[PDB]
Amino acid sequence: IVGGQECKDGECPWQALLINEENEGFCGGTILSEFYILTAAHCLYQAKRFKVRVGDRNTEQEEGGEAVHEVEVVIKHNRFTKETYDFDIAVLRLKTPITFRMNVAPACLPERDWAESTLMTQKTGIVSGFGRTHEKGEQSTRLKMLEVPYVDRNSCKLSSSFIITQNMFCAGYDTKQEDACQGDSGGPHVTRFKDTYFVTGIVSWGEGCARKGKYGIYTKVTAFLKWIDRSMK
Amino acid sequence: KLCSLDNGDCDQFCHEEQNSVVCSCARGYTLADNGKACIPTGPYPCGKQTLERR
Numbered sequence: 611i612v613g614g615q616e617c618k619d620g621e622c623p624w625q626a627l628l629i630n631e632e633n634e635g636f637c638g639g640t641i642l643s644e645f646y647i648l649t650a651a652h653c654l655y656q657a658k659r660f661k662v663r664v665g666d667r668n669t670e671q672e673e674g675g676e677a678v679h680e681v682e683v684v685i686k687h688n689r690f691t692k693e694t695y696d697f698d699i700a701v702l703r704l705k706t707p708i709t710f711r712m713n714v715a716p717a718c719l720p721e722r723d724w725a726e727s728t729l730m731t732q733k734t735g736i737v738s739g740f741g742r743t744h745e746k747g748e749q750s751t752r753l754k755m756l757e758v759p760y761v762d763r764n765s766c767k768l769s770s771s772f773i774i775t776q777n778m779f780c781a782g783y784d785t786k787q788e789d790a791c792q793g794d795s796g797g798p799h800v801t802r803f804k805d806t807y808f809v810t811g812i813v814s815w816g817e818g819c820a821r822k823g824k825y826g827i828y829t830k831v832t833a834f835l836k837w838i839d840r841s842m843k
Numbered sequence: 844k845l846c847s848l849d850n851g852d853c854d855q856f857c858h859e860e861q862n863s864v865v866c867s868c869a870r871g872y873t874l875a876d877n878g879k880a881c882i883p884t885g886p887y888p889c890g891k892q893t894l895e896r897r
C-alpha cells in the first residue's frame with residue numbers, strides 16, 4: 611500500500627496473507643468463513659507452493675494471535691486468463707478451520723443487486739495489505755489500509771493501456787500518490803455500510819503503483835457472488 | 844417506501860416490493876423483530892471489526 615495508514619488493532623481482521631516457501635508474503639486474501647479464503651487467480655502462479663497466515667499485523671513481531679493454515683483445495687475461475695487478468699478470482703479451502711478471535715474475522719458477502727445499488731455507488735472503498743510502500747520499494751512489515759475512491763468505468767478505460775473488462779473496476783486516484791501495490795494483489799477491497807464491511811473487490815493489477823494517470827484495477831466481486839457461493843458449497 | 848432513502852431504514856440489505864421494503868441480513872445475523880436491524884448470532888460476525896476484546 612502506497613500512502614494510507616497502518617491498520618489499527620482489530621480494524622482489518624479479514625486480511626489474509628499468502629506465504630511462499632520461506633514464510634514471505636507475496637499476495638493477500640480475504641477471510642470469507644472458517645474454511646474459505648478469497649484471493650486472485652493470478653496469485654496462484656506467483657509461488658510453486660504456499661500457505662495462508664491470519665491474525666498478523668506485524669510480520670517481524672510474534673503477538674501470539676497469528677495462525678498458519680494449509681490449503682486443501684484451490685478453486686480457480688475456469689475463465690481466468692493471464693493475458694488480460696480477466697476473471698481474476700480464486701477461492702481456497704483450508705485443511706483446518708480458522709478460529710475467529712481478535713484480528714481474525716470474515717468479511718461479509720453482500721447480495722448482488724443491493725451491492726450494485728448501494729455499495730458500488732459509495733464514494734470509497736478500502737484496500738489493505740502488506741505490499742510495497744512505493745512502486746520500486748519494499749514490502750511493509752506492518753499491515754496498511756487505504757481509502758480508495760471508486761473511479762468511473764469510462765475514465766478507467768481511457769486511462770488504461772490494457773483492456774478493462776466488465777469483470778474489473780478502477781479505484782484510487784489520478785495523481786494523488788496513494789494506491790495498492792505489488793504484494794497487495796489478491797487482498798481485500800471492502801466497502802463500509804453502517805459499520806459493516808462487505809467484500810467488493812480483489813486487488814488485481816496496476817500499471818506500476820500510484821502512477822499519474824493510472825488507477826488500481828480490482829476484480830468486480832459482484833460479478834462473482836454466485837460463483838463464490840457455488841465454490842464454497 | 845424506498846430503498847433509495849436511508850436504505851429503507853434497513854441495517855444491511857434492502858429490496859423494494861410493490862408498496863413496501865423488505866430488509867435482510869448476511870449469514871451470521873438475524874433480522875430483528877422490528878424488521879430493520881441485523882443482530883449478530885455470534886461473537887465474530889462477518890464484516891465487524893474486532894474491537895471488543897473478549
Ligand SMILES: C[N+](C)(C)CCCN1C(=O)[C@@H]2[C@H](C1=O)[C@H](c1ncc(-c3ccc(Cl)s3)o1)N1CCC[C@@H]21
Nearest residue numbers: 693694695772790791792795814815816818826827
Ligand atoms: C496487463 N496485465 C496482464 C493485466 C497486467 C498485469 C500486471 N500484473 C502482474 O503481472 C502482477 C500484478 C500486476 O499488476 C502485480 C502488481 N503490480 C502492481 C500491482 C497493483 C497496483 C495497483 C493495484 Cl489495485 S494491484 O499489482 N505484479 C507484481 C507481482 C506480480 C505482478
Ligand code: NA
Nearest residue numbers: 668671672673
Ligand atoms: Na506477527
Ligand code: NA
Nearest residue numbers: 783784821824
Ligand atoms: Na494514479
